[PDB]
Structures are given as structure tokens and as C-alpha cells.
Swiss-Prot record, chain A:
UniProt-recorded name of the protein: RuvB-like 2
Organism: Homo sapiens (Human)
Subcellular location: Nucleus matrix; Nucleus, Nucleoplasm; Cytoplasm; Membrane
Boundaries of the shown chain within the full protein: 134 to 265 of 463
Domain of life the protein comes from: Eukaryota
Keyword Flavoprotein: no
Family, as annotated: Belongs to the RuvB family.
Keyword S-adenosyl-L-methionine applies: no
Gene that encodes the chain: RUVBL2
Primary subcellular site in the record, as a coarse category: nucleus
Any GO BP: regulation of transcription by RNA polymerase II
Swiss-Prot record, chain D:
UniProt similarity note: Belongs to the histone H4 family.
Location of N6-glutaryllysine modifications: K8, K36, K54, K56, K68
Gene: H4C1
Placement of covalent cross-link Glycyl lysine isopeptide (Lys-Gly) (interchain with G-Cter in UFM1): K8
Name recorded for this polypeptide: Histone H4
Modified residues (Phosphoserine): S24
Primary site of residence: nucleus
Associated disease: Tessadori-Bicknell-Van Haaften neurodevelopmental syndrome 1: An autosomal dominant disorder with onset in infancy, characterized by poor overall growth, microcephaly, hypotonia, profound global developmental delay, impaired intellectual development, poor or absent speech, and characteristic dysmorphic facial features, including hypertelorism and abnormal nose. Other variable neurologic and systemic features may also occur.
Modified residues (N6-succinyllysine): K8, K54, K56, K68
Glycyl lysine isopeptide (Lys-Gly) (interchain with G-Cter in ubiquitin), cross-linked positions: K68
UniProt entry keywords in alphabetical sequence: Acetylation, Chromosomal rearrangement, Chromosome, Citrullination, Disease variant, DNA-binding, Hydroxylation, Intellectual disability, Isopeptide bond, Methylation, Nucleosome core, Nucleus, Phosphoprotein, Ubl conjugation
Recorded consequence of changing K68Q: In TEBIVANED1; results in severe early developmental defects when expressed in zebrafish embryos; results in defective cell cycle progression when expressed in zebrafish embryos
Listed GO biological process terms: chromatin organization; negative regulation of megakaryocyte differentiation; nucleosome assembly; protein localization to CENP-A containing chromatin; telomere organization
Shown chain mapped onto the complete sequence: 25 to 103 of 103
Species: Homo sapiens (Human)
Variant or mutagenesis effect after changing E40Q: In a breast cancer sample; somatic mutation
UniProtKB/Swiss-Prot annotation, chain F:
Function according to Swiss-Prot or TrEMBL: Possesses single-stranded DNA-stimulated ATPase and ATP-dependent DNA helicase (3' to 5') activity; hexamerization is thought to be critical for ATP hydrolysis and adjacent subunits in the ring-like structure contribute to the ATPase activity. Component of the NuA4 histone acetyltransferase complex which is involved in transcriptional activation of select genes principally by acetylation of nucleosomal histones H4 and H2A. This modification may both alter nucleosome-DNA interactions and promote interaction of the modified histones with other proteins which positively regulate transcription.
Protein name, per record: RuvB-like 1
Location(s) in or outside the cell: Nucleus matrix; Nucleus, Nucleoplasm; Cytoplasm; Membrane
Full protein: residues contained: 153 to 254 of 456
Sequence similarity: Belongs to the RuvB family.
Location in chain, cross-link Glycyl lysine isopeptide (Lys-Gly) (interchain with G-Cter in SUMO1): K73
Record comment regarding domains: Binding to MYC is dependent on a Myc domain essential for oncogenic activity.
From Swiss-Prot, chain G:
Family in the record: Belongs to the histone H2A family.
N6-lactoyllysine PTM sites in chain numbering: K2
Positions bearing N6-(beta-hydroxybutyryl)lysine: K2, K6, K29, K88, K111
Source organism: Homo sapiens
Superkingdom of the source species: Eukaryota
Keywords: Acetylation, Chromosome, Citrullination, DNA-binding, Hydroxylation, Isopeptide bond, Methylation, Nucleosome core, Nucleus, Phosphoprotein, Ubl conjugation
One GO term of the biological process aspect: protein localization to CENP-A containing chromatin
Record-linked Pfam families: Histone (PF00125), Histone_H2A_C (PF16211)
Positions of region (Disordered): 1-14
GO cellular component, one term: nucleus
Function comment: Core component of nucleosome. Nucleosomes wrap and compact DNA into chromatin, limiting DNA accessibility to the cellular machineries which require DNA as a template. Histones thereby play a central role in transcription regulation, DNA repair, DNA replication and chromosomal stability. DNA accessibility is regulated via a complex set of post-translational modifications of histones, also called histone code, and nucleosome remodeling.
Protein name (record): Histone H2A type 1-B/E
Subunit structure of this chain's protein: The nucleosome is a histone octamer containing two molecules each of H2A, H2B, H3 and H4 assembled in one H3-H4 heterotetramer and two H2A-H2B heterodimers. The octamer wraps approximately 147 bp of DNA.
């Protein structure tokens, strides 16, 4: 079970520690969030701008930017804004080969040797 | 007949442009803060409990369910898509009502 | 000897609050003094007329709020009412 | 429908009190637009006065005050 | 559905219930901002058989001043923050009490009185009250004390010194009263500025904003029905409201409140559906941030007033968490409180959460029992004469009353 | 400025204070633990796991890059007698090449 | 006794920068009404302060875009005549030595 945010960013402001405020939209609703520091250091790091569509794994703050909304394509992937509510709990179902558990356990970063054949 | 009839005045006065019948509670407090207190002394201005140490939850204004969201327009807290569909149909009067009920940004 | 009663330090403090890099020529200070004095006369005149029409001895926050609602245009009236209510909100605590 | 209550011959009558000899066929609906925005600008100020006065019938005084403020004043309604 | 209102009873009696044994029978009174309770002490049964005058503390007069009123029938009240803060609007409440309970012979009350007061009383209000008692009514001796500690004194196993937290729930304020060696530890006592009045006002404002189709059909006297009957307090509020979210549990637990009847049926006679609202108004005392007001609430106060004591005496003074007052009537209140206390106590450690025998009445029964047992302790009571020599704010250091502090109040 | 660390732990079954040595605290510091995190400490072995922030603080900001978890419903302090099975070959291999420690 | 040393201003209690006490002083001595509310000058000061913040922000943008940081009447005129809301608020007024907003009619432009 994973908590994912997914929306068009409508507006985003940052002050000068840091505090900032971010607004997100679906085709069906709008929202504003006061951001915490460890989101500010992600939204700024990934150069997010108003009219982007973004998906955020809330437990980690990685920004999966999907494209820009068709109305702010004006002045290069363009996309419809997400549907439903912004914060979805969704089940992710994941399949790992039993060997892929053997390898992750064998080195400081085992999974590289899964691709490279190094192990 | 009555438990007494020969009462007399004990603080309220008809004269001037001031209270005829009582002293307001804030005046009682402000005139008590002047007394020769020390830190052991139990005092009616000092019994107010602290501000909370953990932050307050967002319960949705329109339904009390937990609010993952707040609206950029109405500034209320809401929980679900049909609540967002509902709040954008409210008149401004109840929106400022709900905000005032939480001492937020309107009067 | 003589006096002028200008807003100069307050308008300059507001400038440094909105744009920390920016400064005022005294000719522009003359614009701002004329402006804020004239808008004060407009609002206080509107509120005075409005209170007299309503046969009151008083102007209060609702007389001035209504006088501002008459005098100001579109989005500037919305923001002015927002700041007027925010200030009264944070003052009354 | 309500805005079309400013009748097509009323545009001609008003313009004929206004001294004009002839009307182009495009004048009418945009002139209803001008009358609409003028009405709206005075009526909204009148309601703004009426709301401060607590009342909710729009009085002749509420609209006299709006017209007086907007420098489009009238006499005969008890100014 | 709503019940119809009840008011204007006829509890009129003779000069006084004089009895065998002691000639003096004291008046017993319970005090603050909701609802009076009063009566003669009347020794004769172990439970008090007839408390009287159970009436809403609200005052009125006719528009021309030709008549006044004080019994239950807009109106006025002599209180704020559960402290008396009016002169003649308080006298007429005492008048109504004495006039119904009995006048013995002349222009004074017959016999001594026990009279509850706020957790602290400001160093003007107890004086002003005692002055409005002695000069206006001539009482022969007086006993101040606290409603909550009296309700504890009734619910004690026996006449003894004891320790506890009294979790009080007054109409305006909820106070947490650590008591040690039989006495209030008032040096570190705390309160929350919220209680029954605020919960009722909140429940009103919710339903006013929810049903503008009939703003006038809902009022405090109707809120008291959904508040004192249909409301309940959660075991864990974020969990109860999460369980409230699903439609089947909603339709099983939402309460219909049919307005007084003459769109299918309801067009002017809606059912005022309460759901989560029947939790929110209860929760105000635990989380005052459901209102605008930032305060610790009845949970973080019970932490903050407790962790300041030595590690061993905490287990002793928690051995009676005692719950009393108006809000504590809610179903599930002990269950919430013990489910909450279980988080904040040391891992293996014991506690007991004793609910009062009757959370609204027991302050009067406690005051009765205290006055009956201490009836001749002339170091406990203030004698009429002592008001001429002491500062009038003066009190005499005893169980079920505030800690005294020597002060002089000038007059000019 | 260093001796040992007192830490307080809380669950929906009660509270304790522990007396962690500085070599445990070096792992709380490395895990980036602060007051209000939910923690698992294994007192035999100094296995310290951050498990996300306690969800009583899930409104510290409206959106922040921490997973929030409910206050544990279990006991603050669990004892089990356990039995470790370990071959001589595990001892050989875990010593013969310099351990990871990484 | 004596009055309070360093007694806090109505302005700084409100969180405002404008002189709320002077606004009350001038409302009363300006004869606008025989009595004046205590929160009336708070509200008025906040509106004058808001208009001041907005007009100076737009003038500072006009200065920045003009490659300057000292405001002169020109930057205020450029702000006031670019913004339709300030323009329609300020129709009956001249900004002294600010000039006029540069505008060529479409019929006068090339070809």
C-alpha cells in the first residue's frame, strides 16, 4: 500500500531555514499545501514550475514529472491533468525473482551485479 | 415576606459614565496582577493550561472526517472529492462562518 | 519653526518590505505623499457622507469598509478588504 | 429572457430623443451592453449602500447615492 | 425527535425543615455558570433524599421594570469563566433560592451555608460574594469550597485524607486538580477555558452552517438534547471518525432529529442529521483546536501537570483519577480516559479512573456530607463576625477548598 | 559533553526511559532520528531502525517528505527467549575475509 | 503613579507599519464625524498600506524593467498606466514629471 500525490501544480512559492506553499489540481479538485523542508529541497532541486503535472511518492519526495498541462504548453511533452483526488492510496503489486533476492543480499549494492553479471 | 428588604450598595454606582451594576472579569484580573505575589502563590491568572506541544490535526470543516486537503479558494479543510464538489456550491457567508469558527483569516 | 506632517518613513518602510533593493527619489516621495493624503481624503469623505446618510455620530470599521468597497475598483478592492480584515483580525487579539 | 426587454423600437425612440436621424442595424445589442454595464455599475453601488444600511429593499436613496458618487446625479427623488 | 421543554415548577415550602438532634440545619448550595442546586442539609438518610431547585442559572425582568424573574420559565446571566461577576443579578438568584426553600422569621437567612466556588476565586470576587452574603442576608457562619472536590469527598471510600487528579468538567471550564494529602495542590493545578457551554455553542454553529434552511429551528435548549443525550466521546477520535467514513456505518450511527412536523415530507420539517457532529462537540475538551483556541486540552494537561512530580508520587496521586461535572456525563468518557491514560503512564504501571456516582449531582451531595460532618468545626467555617475583622477575601485552609494566601484588599 | 543518552519511548500500551550507550546513539544519529520518530531498538545487538515519523506529528506541515506511521499498538518492551543456529562454516566465512562493516 | 514607559503602538499590535494613531488623530481633527471607532483607523491604515505596497511593487518592477532601482515619478506613471485597476482608480490625477505611457495608434504604425 503506497501514498501517492498526483496533480497539476497550479502555483508554487518559496521564501528565504525555508518555508513555501504549493498548490495542486486534478480535473476534479484543487488544493493548497504548506510544504516541509524535505519537500522544499526536492521541488527546488527538480526545478518544478507552475503548469507541470507531477506525481510524488509522499514517503520519499521523488518528483515524477509527467509533462505540462495543455493550457501552459503556450510559450515538450504535453498532457491532461490527473483525475480523481490528489492523494491516492494505491496498491502496488511487485514481483521479484528468488535469484533477485539472492543477489541484493550479496554485495554493498548487490542489484548492480544483477544487471552487470558481476556476481 | 422576604429573606431581607434592608439591602445596601456594595460596588455598583449610578454616577458618571461607568458600570452601574458590576466590574468586568478582565478588570478583576488586571487589578489582581498588581498584588504582592510570589511563585508559590496559586493565582487565577496562572492556572491557564499551556499551548499544545503536538500540532493540531486537520479535521474537514464540512464533515469532520480527516482532511488530507485544504482549498486554495475557500481556505477550508476537506476530505473527499464529493466534499470539494459541495464546498464550491456554498455561499460565502457559511464559508466565512466555518473559518471564524476556527479563528481563521476572516470576521 | 514650521511643520509638514508627511508619511515619508512609513511609505519607505513599505518599499523595503516589498522590494529590499529599491529606493525613493524625494520627487517620487512627493507623488506618494500626495497620493496617500488624497486617498485618505476620498475614503474619509465617503465614510463621512455614508455615516451622515445613515444619521450616525460614528464612523467605525464597517463605515470605512463600505466606503473602501465603493471607492476601490476590481481586484484591488478584494485585496484591500482582505488586508483590512486581516489587520483588524490580528489587532483584536 | 430579460435583457431584450430593452425593445428594438425603444433604441430608436431613445436615439430619436437624442436627436439622431438614422440607426445602423448593429447599434442595438451593443447599446443594450452599454445600458447593462451602466445599470450594473450604479445598481451594485446602490446595493453596497443598502447592505451597510442593513435593509434589503433597494431604496431611491440607495440609487441616488450611487448616481451622486458616480457624478450621474438626479433630482426629484428627495436628494 | 426533540422533546418538549419543561420549566416553571412549584417547589414552595414552609419556614424550614427543623429536625430532632441539632437545632441548626445548614443550607447546601452548588455553584458556577450552568444550573443551581440547593437545599437544607437534612440529616436522616445516608443518601440525600431531596435536593431541590435544580434550575438553570438565568435572570430576567419585564420591559417597563414593573416585575422581575429568576426561576426557570432573551435573558441574562451573572457569570463568566465560572466566577460570579455581577451584583444585584446574583442577589436575585439567592433571593429565589431562599424564597422557595424557606424564610424563618426576619430579614436574615436562618442558618449557616455551604457554598461552592471556582477552582481559584479571584481576590475580589469571593470578597464581593461574601459581602453580598453577610450584609444582604446576615448568614451566621459560611463555608466556601470547590464543587469538584466536594463530589470527590462524597465518592471517597471513607472520611479520610487521600490523593487524586480531579478531572472537572464545568459549564465554561474543565480543570485538572491534583490533590495531595487531602488538599488541592493549587501551586501546579491547570485548566482549559472550555466545557459544556462551548460544546453546545459549537454544536449550534455546526448545525446553523449545515442547515441555513431553518436557522431559527435550532437553539441552545434544543442543542442540550443532542448534547446531553445523543452525543458520545471517542476511544480514539481519529479512529472513530475513520470508522464513521463508510456509508453503511454512517446510516447505522447517524442520528435523526425530526423537527416538530405539521420533496417527500421533510420540506419544512427536516431531520437535522447529526453524524461526526455527535462526536465533535464532545471532543472539544480533549482537542480545543477543534475550535480556534490553542490549549493543551484534557489529555496534554494531564501529561503536563503530572510529569512535574517525583516518579513515585505520580503513581500514588494517579491512584484516583476522578471524573466529575457536566461534560463527564457523556457515554464512553471513562473508556476514553483510561484508553488515553494507558498511553502516557509507565509501561507496566497501575492506574484507576473512578467516575462519580452522579457526575452532575455529586458536588451538592458532597457539599451536604461535608457540611453535615464538619457542622461544628468552628476553625473550618467563617463566623459572621470574622468578616468585620478580616479582609473579607479571607479563607481558613481545609479539605475541599482552595489553598489560602494572606493578602490585604484596600477600601477608599 | 558526552557520557550516555537517556531516551524516552511511548506506545498505546505505555512509556519507558532507556539508558542508551554512546555507541547506540551513534546509530540513532546515523539513522537521522529526532524526537517524535517511531523507533525499533534491539537491546542485545544495537539494531536501531527508524520506522517513519509518529502520525501525531502528521500535520507538522501539510505535505513533507517523511512517511508517517501510527503510534505502535504493541508493548513498549518485549522479551523473547530465542535460539540462534550458526554453523562453524558461518564463523569461518564471516571472519576469514575482512567484514563489510559498510 | 505614572503612565506606561514604551507602551506598544496600535500599528505594531495590529502588525501594520502605517501610523494607526495618526489615522485616528486625523479622522477626529479632520472633522469627518463627531465620534470615531477604535478599529476604523486600523482598517483604514491597512488599506492605505496595502495600496502603498501594491503601487510601489509595480513601480519597482517598472524601475527594474527600466534598468533602475531608485523610483522616480516615471516608474509610478508606467506602473499606474500599465495596470488597468490602478488606471481606473487614478483617472482624475496627473503624476507630476512622470510623462505619459508610450503609445502609437495602429493606423500610424508602418505599412
Amino acid at each position: 500500500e503506497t501514498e501517492i500525490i498526483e496533480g497539476e501544480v497550479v502555483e508554487i512559492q518559496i521564501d528565504r531555514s525555508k518555508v513555501g506553499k504549493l498548490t495542486l489540481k486534478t480535473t476534479e479538485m484543487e488544493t493548497i499545501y504548506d510544504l516541509g523542508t524535505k519537500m522544499i529541497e526536492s521541488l527546488t532541486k527538480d526545478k518544478v514550475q507552475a503548469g507541470d503535472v507531477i506525481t510524488i511518492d509522499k514517503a520519499t519526495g521523488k518528483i515524477s514529472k509527467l509533462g505540462r498541462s495543455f493550457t501552459r504548453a503556450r510559450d515538450t511533452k504535453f498532457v491532461q491533468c490527473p483525475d480523481g483526488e490528489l492523494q491516492k492510496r494505491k496498491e502496488v503489486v511487485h514481483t521479484v525473482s528468488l535469484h533477485e533476492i539472492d543477489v541484493i543480499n550479496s554485495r554493498t549494492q548487490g542489484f548492480l551485479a544483477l544487471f552487470s553479471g558481476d556476481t | 415576606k422576604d429573606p431581607n428588604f434592608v439591602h445596601s450598595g456594595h460596588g455598583g454606582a449610578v454616577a458618571g459614565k461607568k458600570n452601574r451594576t458590576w466590574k468586568n472579569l478582565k478588570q478583576i484580573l488586571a487589578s489582581e496582577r498588581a498584588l504582592p505575589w510570589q511563585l508559590n502563590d496559586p493565582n487565577y491568572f496562572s492556572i491557564d493550561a499551556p499551548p499544545s506541544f503536538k500540532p493540531a490535526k486537520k479535521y474537514s470543516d464540512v464533515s469532520g472526517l480527516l482532511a488530507n486537503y485544504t482549498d486554495p479558494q475557500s481556505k477550508l479543510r476537506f476530505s473527499t472529492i464529493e466534499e470539494f464538489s459541495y464546498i464550491r456550491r456554498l455561499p460565502s457567508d457559511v464559508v466565512t462562518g466555518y473559518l471564524a469558527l476556527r479563528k481563521a483569516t476572516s470576521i | 519653526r514650521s511643520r509638514k506632517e508627511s508619511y515619508s518613513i512609513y511609505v519607505y518602510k513599505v518599499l523595503k518590505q516589498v522590494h529590499p533593493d529599491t529606493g525613493i527619489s524625494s520627487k517620487a516621495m512627493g507623488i506618494m505623499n500626495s497620493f496617500v493624503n488624497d486617498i485618505f481624503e476620498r475614503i474619509a469623505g465617503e465614510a463621512s457622507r455614508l455615516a451622515h446618510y445613515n444619521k450616525r455620530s460614528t464612523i467605525t470599521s464597517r463605515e470605512i469598509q463600505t466606503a473602501v468597497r465603493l471607492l476601490l475598483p476590481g481586484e484591488l478592492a478584494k485585496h484591500a478588504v482582505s488586508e483590512g480584515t486581516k489587520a483588524v483580525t490580528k489587532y483584536t487579539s | 429572457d430579460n435583457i431584450q426587454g430593452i425593445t428594438k423600437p425603444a433604441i430608436r425612440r431613445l436615439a430619436r430623443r437624442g436627436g439622431v436621424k438614422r440607426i445602423s442595424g448593429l447599434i442595438y445589442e451593443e447599446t443594450r451592453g452599454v445600458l447593462k454595464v451602466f445599470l450594473e455599475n450604479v445598481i451594485r453601488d446602490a446595493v453596497t449602500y443598502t447592505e451597510h444600511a442593513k435593509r434589503k429593499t433597494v431604496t431611491a436613496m440607495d440609487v441616488v447615492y450611487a448616481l451622486k458618487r458616480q457624478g450621474r446625479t438626479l433630482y426629484g427623488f428627495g436628494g | 425527535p426533540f422533546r418538549d421543554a419543561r420549566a416553571a415548577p412549584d417547589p414552595v415550602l414552609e419556614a424550614g425543615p427543623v429536625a430532632h438532634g441539632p437545632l441548626p440545619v445548614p443550607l447546601v448550595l452548588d455553584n458556577g455558570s450552568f444550573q443551581v442546586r440547593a437545599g437544607w442539609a437534612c440529616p436522616g438518610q445516608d443518601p440525600g433524599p431531596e435536593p431541590r431547585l435544580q434550575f438553570r442559572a438565568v435572570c430576567a425582568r419585564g420591559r417597563g421594570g414593573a416585575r422581575g424573574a429568576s426561576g426557570p420559565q432573551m435573558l441574562r446571566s451573572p457569570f463568566d469563566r465560572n466566577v460570579p461577576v455581577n451584583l444585584e443579578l446574583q442577589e436575585l438568584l439567592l433571593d429565589y433560592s431562599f424564597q422557595h426553600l424557606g424564610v424563618s422569621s426576619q430579614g436574615c437567612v436562618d442558618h449557616p451555608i455551604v457554598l461552592t466556588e471556582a477552582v481559584c476565586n479571584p481576590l475580589y470576587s469571593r470578597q464581593m460574594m461574601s459581602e453580598l452574603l453577610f450584609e444582604c442576608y446576615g448568614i451566621p457562619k459560611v463555608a466556601y469550597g470547590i464543587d469538584s472536590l466536594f463530589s470527590f469527598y462524597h465518592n471517597k471510600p471513607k472520611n479520610s485524607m487521600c490523593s487524586g487528579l480531579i478531572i472537572s468538567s464545568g459549564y465554561q471550564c474543565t480543570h485538572v486538580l491534583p490533590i495531595l494529602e487531602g488538599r488541592l495542590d493549587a501551586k501546579n493545578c491547570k485548566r482549559i477555558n472550555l466545557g459544556g457551554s462551548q460544546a453546545a455553542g459549537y454544536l449550534q454553529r455546526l448545525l446553523q452552517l449545515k442547515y441555513p434552511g431553518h436557522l431559527a429551528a435550532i437553539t441552545l435548549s434544543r442543542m442540550e438534547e443532542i448534547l446531553h443525550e445523543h452525543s458520545y466521546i471517542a476511544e480514539d477520535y481519529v479512529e472513530e471518525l475513520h470508522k464513521w467514513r463508510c456509508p453503511d456505518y454512517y446510516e447505522n450511527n447517524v442520528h435523526k432529529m425530526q423537527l416538530p412536523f405539521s420533496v417527500f415530507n421533510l420540506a419544512a420539517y427536516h431531520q437535522l442529521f447529526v453524524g461526526t457532529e455527535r462526536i465533535r462537540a464532545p471532543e472539544i475538551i480533549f482537542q480545543p483546536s477543534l475550535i480556534g483556541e490553542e490549549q493543551a486540552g484534557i489529555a496534554e494537561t494531564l501529561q503536563y501537570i503530572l510529569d512535574r512530580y517525583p516518579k513515585d508520587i505520580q503513581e500514588m496521586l494517579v491512584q484516583n483519577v476522578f471524573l466529575t461535572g457536566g461534560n463527564t456525563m457523556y457515554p464512553g468518557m471513562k473508556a476514553r480516559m483510561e484508553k488515553e491514560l494507558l498511553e502516557m503512564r509507565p509501561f507496566r504501571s497501575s492506574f484507576q479512573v473512578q467516575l462519580a456516582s452522579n457526575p452532575v449531582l455529586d458536588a451538592w451531595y458532597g457539599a451536604r456530607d461535608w457540611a453535615l460532618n464538619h457542622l461544628d468545626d468552628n476553625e473550618v467555617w467563617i463566623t459572621r463576625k470574622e468578616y468585620e475583622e478580616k479582609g473579607g477575601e479571607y479563607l481558613k485552609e481545609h479539605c475541599a477548598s482552595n489553598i489560602y494566601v494572606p493578602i490585604r484588599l484596600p477600601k477608599q | 559533553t558526552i557520557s550516555h543518552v537517556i531516551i524516552g519511548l511511548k506506545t498505546a500500551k505505555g512509556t519507558k526511559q532507556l539508558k542508551l550507550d554512546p555507541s547506540i546513539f551513534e546509530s540513532l544519529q546515523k539513522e537521522r532520528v529526532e524526537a517524535g520518530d517511531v523507533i525499533y531498538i534491539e537491546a542485545n545487538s544495537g539494531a536501531v531502525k527508524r520506522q517513519g515519523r509518529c502520525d501525531t506529528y502528521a500535520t507538522e506541515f501539510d505535505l513533507e517528505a517523511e512517511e508517517y506511521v501510527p503510534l505502535p499498538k504493541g508493548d513498549v518492551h518485549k522479551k523473547k527467549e530465542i535460539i540462534q543456529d550458526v554453523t562453524l562454516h558461518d564463523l569461518d566465512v564471516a571472519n576469514a575475509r575482512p567484514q563489510g562493516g559498510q | 503613579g505614572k503612565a506606561r514607559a514604551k507602551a506598544k503602538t496600535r500599528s505594531s499590535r495590529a502588525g501594520l507599519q502605517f501610523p494607526v494613531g495618526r489615522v485616528h488623530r486625523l479622522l477626529r481633527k479632520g472633522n469627518y464625524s463627531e465620534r470615531v471607532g477604535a478599529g476604523a483607523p486600523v482598517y483604514l491604515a491597512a488599506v492605505l498600506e496595502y495600496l502603498t505596497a501594491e503601487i510601489l511593487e509595480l513601480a519597482g518592477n517598472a524601475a527594474r524593467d527600466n534598468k533602475k532601482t531608485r523610483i522616480i515619478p516615471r516608474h509610478l506613471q508606467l506602473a499606474i498606466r500599465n495596470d488597468e485597476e490602478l488606471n481606473k482608480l487614478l483617472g482624475r490625477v496627473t503624476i507630476a514629471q512622470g510623462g505619459v505611457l508610450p503609445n502609437i495608434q495602429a493606423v500610424l504604425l508602418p505599412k
